[model samples]
Target: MVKQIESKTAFQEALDAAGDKLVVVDFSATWCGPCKMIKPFFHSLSEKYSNVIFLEVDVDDCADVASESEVKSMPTFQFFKKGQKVGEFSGANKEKLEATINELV
Candidate 1:
């Protein structure tokens, strides 16, 4: 199951634990229309790609978390591995989203 980032500390712990494994964080907001559109797809990706760690962060609920990450837009996907960000993009680009996962895995 995709993990929900409950707090900034939790997010940091997950990031720290990721090490060399791929970690995908879906930064979105409940009020954002496009975020709703891509959320189901994002959840599906989490199920399909069990080898990866998928995290969900609500921009509104976790404002500090989002702010700390410098998330400028909703439905932004950030990819990290070996404690370094490998890729990132904003908006609901399903093709690119899956492509990134495929490329990382």
Candidate 2:
């Protein structure tokens, strides 16, 4: 399922829940128009995969958590597996997102 999360609390909880699995986080913000445009498509592609915990982190609300991940871009995505970052893909591209998701899984 596609999960939308905010703050360190939500993120930490998800990480704990993702034990021994792949996790995908879409780091975004309300002010970012691109983020709004991409969420639906992002969710669709996210649901197409399994064994992965997919979620979103609003940069504005979760600045500390978002900054820790070094999110230089608005729609930055951080991929994690076993609680560690394995890879990432940013911005809006359905094809590239799917390819990366497939590769991670």
Candidate 3:
């Protein structure tokens, strides 16, 4: 299951714990339609890429985390490795999302 980030501290700890592993964070909100649609696929990705760490942050629930990451829209995907952001994009395209993960992994 994709881990739900509830606080800024939790988010930082999660990244630190991941070490150099690929970490994907989904920044979304409960009312976002595309975010809801992509939720299942995101979970499936976590299972498929077991070596990677997947995290979900509800914008409303963790606004500080969202703002810290500069998330401007719903369903924004952020990629990190070694506690640094490597890439990011905003959308709900499954193909693009998987492709990016495969490239990073």
Candidate 4:
């Protein structure tokens, strides 16, 4: 399931729930072009990696978490494993995005 994280607290809770699995946090905005493009890509990955937890964090609605995480781009993706942040990326590029996510899986 794709969970919605609206706060830093909620993100933490999801991290805990994820345990040792990969938790991918997609920080985006409904109005962002790159964000919209990446949404379905993440959705497709979500289907393959059923053990991975997919999370949607809207920068505008989840201002606190977005600010706390220092997200400055339209679509920033953060990868977490075993409750610790491992990697992230920002910008466009479908191939690179999928490759980066494959690392988590």
Candidate 5:
């Protein structure tokens, strides 16, 4: 399941707990059209990639995290490993997103 991050603290703690494991965070917003459209796909990815830690962050709810991540667009996907950001991309390209995950995994 995709964990919904409620605060910046929680986000950091999640990363800390994840250690060197791949953590995929979907930075989204409630009013974002593309977010809504790709939400199901993200969830499906979560289910399919059980080895990865999937997280969802609402930009409106966690503005600090969004700014901390330097997110300039809705539905920005950030990949992390060993508590460091390894990759990132914006928008809702499903094929590219999956390919990125595959590469990371």
Candidate 6:
């Protein structure tokens, strides 16, 4: 399951917990239509890519985290490798998301 990051501490712990694995964070909001639409695809990716760490952060719930991470858009996907950002994309494109994961992992 894709873990929900509800707090700054939890978000920090997720970054630390990722260790050597790839971490994919979905920055979204409850009011976002595309965010809601793409949620299932994100969860499915979590199952398909067991080696990668998947996380969900609701901007309203974790405002500090979202601000610190500079989430300028809803449904922004940030990719991290060992705590360093390697790639990122904005929007709800399932094919791009999956293709990027396949390339990275």
How close is each model in CA RMSD to the real structure?
1.1, 1.5, 0.6, 1.3, 0.7, 0.9
The numbered model that scores best in TM-score is 3
Q: Is candidate 2 or candidate 4 better by TM-score?
A: 4
Q: What is the lDDT, from 0 to 100, of the residue 57 in candidate 4? A: 93
User: Which model is ahead, 3 or 4, in terms of lDDT?
Assistant: 3
TM-score of each: 0.93, 0.88, 0.98, 0.90, 0.97, 0.95
Which model is ahead, 1 or 2, in terms of TM-score? 1
lDDT of 5 by residue, 32-96 (tens): 99999999999999999988999999998989998889998989999999888889999999998
Q: Model 1 lDDT vs. the true structure?
A: 0.90
Model 1 lDDT at residue 96: 93
Model 3's alpha-carbon lDDT is 0.94
State the lDDT of candidate 2 residue by residue for 75-94, as single tens digits. Answer: 88888887788888788776
Q: Write the per-residue lDDT of candidate 4 for residues 1-105, one digit (tens) a residue.
A: 568887788889989988888888888998899888778887887888788889999999999999988999978888899888888988856687678777776
For 22-61, candidate 3 gives per-residue lDDT tens digits of: 9999999989999999999999999999999999999998
Pairs that collide in candidate 1 are none
Decreasing lDDT order of the candidates: 3, 5, 6, 1, 4, 2
Taken over the whole model, the C-alpha lDDT of each candidate is: 0.90, 0.81, 0.94, 0.84, 0.93, 0.92
Off by over 4 Å in 4: none
Ten-residue stretch with the least lDDT total in model 1: 12-21
Q: Model 6, 1-105: lDDT tens per residue?
A: 999999999978998988889999999999999999999999999998999999999999899999999998889999998888898999999999999888776
Local error of candidate 5 at residue 97 (angstroms):
0.9
Q: Over 4 Å off in model 5, which ranges? A: none
**Clashes per prediction?**
0, 0, 0, 0, 0, 0
